[PDB]
Amino acid sequence: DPVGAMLESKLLEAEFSPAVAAKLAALSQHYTPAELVRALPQSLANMLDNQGDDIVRQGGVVALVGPTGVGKTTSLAKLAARFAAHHGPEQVALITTDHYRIGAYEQLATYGKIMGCPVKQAHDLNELEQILYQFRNRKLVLIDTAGMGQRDMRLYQQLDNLTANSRIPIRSYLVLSATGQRRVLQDAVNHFKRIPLSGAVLTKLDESVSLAGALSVLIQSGLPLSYVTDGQRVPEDMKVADTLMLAQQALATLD
Amino acid sequence: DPVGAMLESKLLEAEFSPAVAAKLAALSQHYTPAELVRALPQSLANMLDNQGDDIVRQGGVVALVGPTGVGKTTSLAKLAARFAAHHGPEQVALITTDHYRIGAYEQLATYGKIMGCPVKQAHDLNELEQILYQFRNRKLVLIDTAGMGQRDMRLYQQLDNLTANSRIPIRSYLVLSATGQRRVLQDAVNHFKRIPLSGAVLTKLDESVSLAGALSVLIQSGLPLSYVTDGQRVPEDMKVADTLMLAQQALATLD
Ligand SMILES: Nc1nc2c(ncn2[C@@H]2O[C@H](COP(=O)(O)OP(=O)(O)O)[C@@H](O)[C@H]2O)c(=O)[nH]1
Ligand SMILES: Nc1nc2c(ncn2[C@@H]2O[C@H](COP(=O)(O)OP(=O)(O)O)[C@@H](O)[C@H]2O)c(=O)[nH]1
């Protein structure tokens, strides 16, 4: 298969994962060279499986989980404001389960003042369950978990709490930085998938050289790409993932 | 060159950079297969050019610079305690030039209470120059800069301040996470080298799959590897870089 082999080779060189590089290489068997120009991005975008801004339209209890310094707190704040700009701040509340960082409550509490929404800290499961029922009238409750290394033995503590009691449904979104090595991102995914994840938030596109590995990991892991962030400005440096745009960007190396 | 080619190929597969992979491949021309077992790690360790714990023995004004969430504040605190455990806390002082983060002073100020050392915030250059002369009797002054994306247009602001006035010498150390893609780390290096750097701090070895790319970037950029961090525990999760150990770890893929 002459064309299939060149495509795959180039896709690997452009930092796509072996699995995705093959799947994309494969459509050279169903398309014209010319059709392929549009078919490559379109297939990649499709695979990334974006679900609009589900947080905003759907609400509910949403938790951000992920390894250290990826931007969970920053992306949480962006989401809060987003939801509040439609709807209203009286409909948003914030929780942190991070009793590690030097005064995590204070950072998040300060965002609360800025954005006009209550902020509570859960020290354990019982308290989290109280706070969530207490906030039942809120349309969006955002939970900020503690950043930990994906192989940290404490990890399950932060994670299993979000999936305990089958009558508080919680949608957990994995926050990953697009700067990470492909294998690190995959390692993170594998360990964090200890609980069901509803999608991924991809941060630091403004620091990234290439999105190919990051996008590949999401494809491979069957994680929808929900939102992207591209700077430090709260709240505007967040977008609903436009997967076609992202696909195009990632494939521009080949061109 | 049969052996040279296989070595390079394997080294590339183990995620070493083209430049370093070639240099290491090259010593198969000067060593026995058996001598090579020890010569590979030894050459790689040599290239990483560690300078003991220079901060501790030497002191002076030390600044940590680097992109977002890499662990500048956390590594600063570790260094402070290290210096204080030898010598004393009355010999250490802390400065932050980060007037961006929601109350950066408070985090660092809280470490100050913990570790028994004064903490000041510089809002501009003049104030930094005052604070440093004010702290002239301190043997170590540690400066925590604001984390920014390596291509952030504000970057020079944080950086040029550390190199203004040729009568306050400051040693800047680049803090980089070992989780980052090789090309991102290199991109970071290139932009941060807008000022002279004295070395690198390599963080999050406990989150890393492989050190090969990270080590390669330091080699290529001629940046000494000063310290490594391998967890979130302040202050003990920091070591002087044992380059031979690191070299061995990075090369164990080939085995
Ligand atoms: N350049 C860039 N920096 C970001 C982005 N998101 C977060 N950051 C920074 O990454 C650092 C970590 O932010 P934080 O929300 O506390 O990460 P967390 O520890 O997971 O909660 C901070 O310096 C943020 O400003 C992004 O999209 N682009
Ligand atoms: N697993 C691991 N996490 C680290 C390490 N160093 C810092 N972190 C975490 O990375 C996050 C960023 O810490 P911080 O010092 O504020 O990074 P900064 O924004 O550059 O100052 C925090 O959650 C730290 O706990 C490390 O060596 N290993």
Numbering used by the authors:
A (entry chain A), B (entry chain A): 183 to 437
Give the exact sentences the study uses for this entry.
The GTPase FlhF, a signal recognition particle (SRP)-type enzyme, is pivotal for spatial–numerical control and bacterial flagella assembly across diverse species, including pathogens. FlhF, together with SRP54 (or Ffh) and FtsY, belongs to an evolutionarily conserved protein family with only three members: the signal recognition particle (SRP) GTPases. The three SRP GTPases share a conserved NG domain, with the N domain comprising an α-helical bundle and the G domain being a GTPase with an α–β–α insertion termed the I-box. The GTPase activity of the FlhF homodimer and its dissociation into a GDP-bound monomer is stimulated by the protein FlhG, which serves as numerical regulator of flagella biosynthesis.
In this report, we present the biochemical and structural analysis of a GDP-bound monomer of FlhF from the polar-flagellated bacterium Shewanella putrefaciens CN32. Expression of NG-FlhF yielded approximately 40 mg per litre of culture (equivalent to 8 g of cells) and protein purification followed standard protocols described previously. Analytical size-exclusion chromatography (SEC) revealed the presence of a monomer. Amino-acid residues 183–437 of NG-FlhF could be unambiguously assigned into the electron-density map and represent almost all of the residues of the protein construct employed in this study. The structure of NG-FlhF reveals that of a classical NG domain of the SRP-GTPase family. The GDP is coordinated by residues of the G1, G4 and G5 elements, which are conserved among the SRP GTPase family. In the GDP-bound state of FlhF, the guanine base of the nucleotide is coordinated by Asp388 and Glu389 of the G4 element. The α- and β-phosphates of GDP are coordinated by Lys254, Thr255 and Thr256 of the G1 element. Density for a magnesium ion was not present within the active site of NG-FlhF. Most prominently, Arg283 within the G2 loop is properly ordered in our structure, coordinating the β-phosphate of the GDP. The binding of GDP introduces a rotation of 20–40° of the helices of the bundle in relation to its center.
